[PDB]
Write a protein that binds this ligand. Structure first.
Ligand SMILES: CCCCCCCCCCCCCCCCCC(=O)OC[C@H](COP(=O)(O)O)OC(=O)CCCCCCCCCCCCCCCCC
Ligand SMILES: COCC(CCO[C@H]1CC[C@@]2(C)C(=CC[C@H]3[C@@H]4C[C@@H]5O[C@]6(CC[C@@H](C)CO6)[C@@H](C)[C@@H]5[C@@]4(C)CC[C@@H]32)C1)COC
Ligand SMILES: COCC(CCO[C@H]1CC[C@@]2(C)C(=CC[C@H]3[C@@H]4C[C@@H]5O[C@]6(CC[C@@H](C)CO6)[C@@H](C)[C@@H]5[C@@]4(C)CC[C@@H]32)C1)COC
Ligand code: NA
Ligand code: NA
Lengths: 544, 205
């Protein structure tokens, strides 16, 4: 049980380590689900055939498949991290992939047979598996083909909508309801109290958060675009309050992380790039604010810090756009193409620096050491490749001042530089982007579909009010959206449905295999050989 | 697809424009001209109108504004993001969706020829500038075709022959496929093996 808890993850708990089993153990029977124990034993001993036999006997096939996938993945990681023979690691990875494929195929069969029971099967609480659900087990194993399935996506959509039945045109009606509280009563609800069920759906919280962020960005633009007084204005106070409330919310969401160690939660949180960028931006804003309430030079420096800081808050709108079905994958593609762009920026820089150094050295041969020399190398050669070409400045004529020695070479090297930069490298980068688009697009779609789950969970676990108004909610401090509690009779119904689905899956697989061309050809050849031998023996006899 | 990228381009452009305007002009009364300086020049820049002496004026010269050296750096980053990354990504998007769009457009145009022909069949002879008179003044072919009994029977017989030939050709194609031949051969081989086993089972000697 301890090893199972170690391998499964953070908050998992095994039945062997609970009080009931310990009390039974330390005063000495039976297992209501023996095949659960048998399959766990087979997986832990790396016996794949035995585990596959045990999987298709008993109840809860999909939960067992997901647990086996997670356990094999963890065991492979542990073997790889202890410097073992490294073939055990690939064997364990193959086992994990086999179990994941089994889970995906079972989900597909269940969804095809009956959609409502398929959705019910992915959410009911698993008493035998640490009170988890199939969706949680799939997310913990990072099974992307499972979450990106149609049934999982529709379940995520239903959890996103909450207790609201509208599906044809959302967003506009949510915004209208937030802006017009009396307009809430005109909406239809699933099976007064409509206000509570409206202001607690994740989509309503998301739209409230988005509107608050838009207003905050508007106020930030206003304060940077107008002249500052000695002390902050009302809009500046609102901006500071929003920044502070967002900072304390980010701080307190670190203390609700799964690990029990304060220093462990910090490094777990510092794994999303948006969190690191948010922390850096908040620190920079704090520095600029504490430097703004001083004498004029420090005030100017703080204002410049504000001006630089507003760019990040502008760029952060892409994170909000990532909720759209089309904009999110595009942002992921941009992030993936930045690396290919950076691999060409270096070559372009080499060529640009060569040209700039040559031009500066030739045209200005009597220069004292100065820092302006480092600027003239990069400035104009960089502006030239974006259309700002001026022949009278790249090579000035020479009433006119005497001609510098070798001044005629500057136009020639300029022509070569323009040809290399604007024709060769640009077109090569275009070809690189063109020929890698398909796989990047597919991967981005899959990753966005997988990451919808964390967005839905995050907005389910958040307060009703947005950051500028959660100042009070900090002092004041799952029937659905996470789980689904089922009764005994409905549990039996779900078990029977799952057993029928797995039986149909195996029968269909056998029928497909037996009717393939290769199997028919093989069987025909064997039967023909045996028949030929039998006929030869029959003709061998001489009864005449 | 172009509109889905215009939004990202607008976000980047507005960030750069607000930063530049705020840094370079620190003493401004609220005015509607501020809303114009954010979009105007940053938009013209990405179409070739780049002027380094105006994006970052030198500073005999007026005193240097605090942080005036950051404008060329953010300008370089903005140009690199706009003219290299997003443009090439949009080119790739157009390139990789061209085939299906072209095929669908061809099919839709071929379908929509019919309504054009009907519309110009149902229209007056005179063109709009002088159809006024027609307004006051107010199908053997082009829509239908009226046929006689003998020709109707001919058309019926032709259709019956065509459907019979269609079914016969479909059956002939199905029966001569490799899969059907393999299946029939396997079944016959199995039955023949069972029959030969039964024949060899007897012992008349
Ligand atoms: C102050 C200067 C502003 C610097 C802000 C750039 C940092 C944003 C990166 C955010 C991130 O890392 O998320 C990763 C994010 C996801 O990682 P994950 O959430 O941890 O899985 O990857 C992305 O999809 C973001 C890709 C879009 C960012 C490209 C736009 C950068 C333009 C900057 C130049 C603007 C021109 C200047 C005017
Ligand atoms: C010449 O005399 C004019 C005077 C009126 C002066 O009022 C000014 C007050 C600030 C205000 C309303 C004005 C110009 C810039 C305006 C900004 C542009 C910003 O752009 C947006 C751009 C896009 C948004 C995402 C961010 O903000 C605005 C929220 C922002 C914006 C509309 C805030 C409002 C600003 C007009 C006459 O009075 C009778
Ligand atoms: C106005 O008064 C200023 C004066 C300071 C004078 O010192 C100068 C001495 C040469 C030095 C340090 C300076 C400017 C160009 C500098 C070059 C730029 C080159 O770029 C790099 C570019 C990229 C590299 C690959 C190649 O070299 C440098 C190795 C190169 C580089 C840093 C060599 C160093 C040069 C400053 C005051 O003194 C107290
Ligand atoms: Na140009
Ligand atoms: Na150009």
């Amino acid at each position: 049980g301890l090893v199972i808890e170690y391998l499964m993850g953070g908050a998992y708990r095994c039945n062997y380590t609970r009080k009931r089993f310990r009390t039974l153990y330390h005063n000495l029977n039976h297992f209501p689900f023996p095949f659960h124990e048998l399959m766990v034993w087979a997986v832990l001993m790396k016996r794949q055939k035995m585990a596959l036999f045990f999987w298709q006997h008993g109840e809860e096939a999909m939960a067992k498949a997901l647990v086996a996938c997670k356990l094999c993945k963890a065991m492979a990681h542990e073997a790889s991290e202890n410097d073992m023979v490294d073939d055990i690691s690939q064997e364990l990875n193959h086992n994990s992939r086999d179990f994941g494929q089994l889970a995906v195929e079972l989900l597909d069969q269940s969804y095809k047979q009956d959609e409502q029971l398929a959705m019910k099967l992915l959410t009911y609480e698993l008493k035998n598996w640490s009170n988890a659900t199939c969706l949680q087990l799939a997310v913990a194993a990072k099974h992307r083909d499972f979450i990106a399935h149609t049934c999982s996506q529709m379940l995520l959509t239903d959890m996103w909508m909450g207790r609201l039945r509208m599906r044809k045109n959302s967003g506009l009606k949510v915004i209208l309801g937030i802006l017009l509280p009396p307009s809430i009563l005109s909406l239809e609800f699933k099976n007064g109290r409509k206000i509570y069920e409206f202001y607690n759906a994740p989509i309503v919280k998301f739209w409230f958060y988005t509107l608050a962020y838009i207003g905050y960005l508007m106020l930030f633009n206003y304060i940077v675009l107008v002249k500052m007084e000695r002390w902050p204005s009302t809009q500046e106070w609102i901006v500071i309050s929003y920044i502070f409330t967002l900072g304390i919310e980010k701080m307190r969401e670190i203390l609700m992380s799964e690990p029990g160690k304060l220093l462990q939660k910090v490094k777990v949180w510092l794994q999303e790039y948006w969190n690191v960028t948010d922390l850096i931006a908040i620190l920079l804003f704090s520095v600029g604010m504490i430097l703004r309430l001083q004498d004029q030079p420090f005030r100017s420096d703080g204002r410049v810090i504000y001006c630089v800081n507003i760019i990040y808050w502008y760029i952060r709108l892409l994170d909000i756009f990532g909720v759209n079905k089309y904009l999110g994958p595009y942002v992921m593609m941009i992030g993936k193409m930045m690396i290919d762009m950076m691999y060409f920026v270096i070559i372009m820089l080499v060529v640009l620096m060569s040209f700039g150094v040559a031009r500066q050295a030739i045209l200005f041969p009597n220069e004292e050491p100065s820092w302006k020399l480092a600027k003239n190398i990069f400035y104009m050669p960089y502006w030239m490749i974006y259309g700002e070409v001026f022949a009278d400045q790249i090579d000035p004529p020479c009433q006119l001042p005497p001609c510098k020695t070798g001044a005629w070479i500057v136009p020639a090297i300029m022509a070569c530089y323009l040809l290399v930069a604007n024709i060769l490298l640009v077109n090569l980068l275009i070809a690189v982007f063109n020929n890698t688009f398909f796989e990047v697009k597919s991967i981005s779609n899959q990753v966005w579909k997988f990451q919808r789950y964390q967005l839905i969970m995050t907005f389910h676990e958040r307060p009703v009010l947005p950051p500028p108004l959660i100042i009070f909610s900090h002092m004041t401090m799952r029937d659905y959206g996470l789980k689904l509690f089922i009764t005994d009779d409905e549990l039996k119904k779900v078990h029977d449905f799952e057993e029928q689905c797995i039986e149909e899956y195996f029968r269909e697989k056998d029928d497909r295999f037996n009717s393939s061309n290769d199997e028919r050809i093989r069987v025909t050849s064997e039967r023909v050989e045996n028949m030929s031998m039998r006929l030869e023996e029959v003709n061998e006899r001489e009864h005449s």
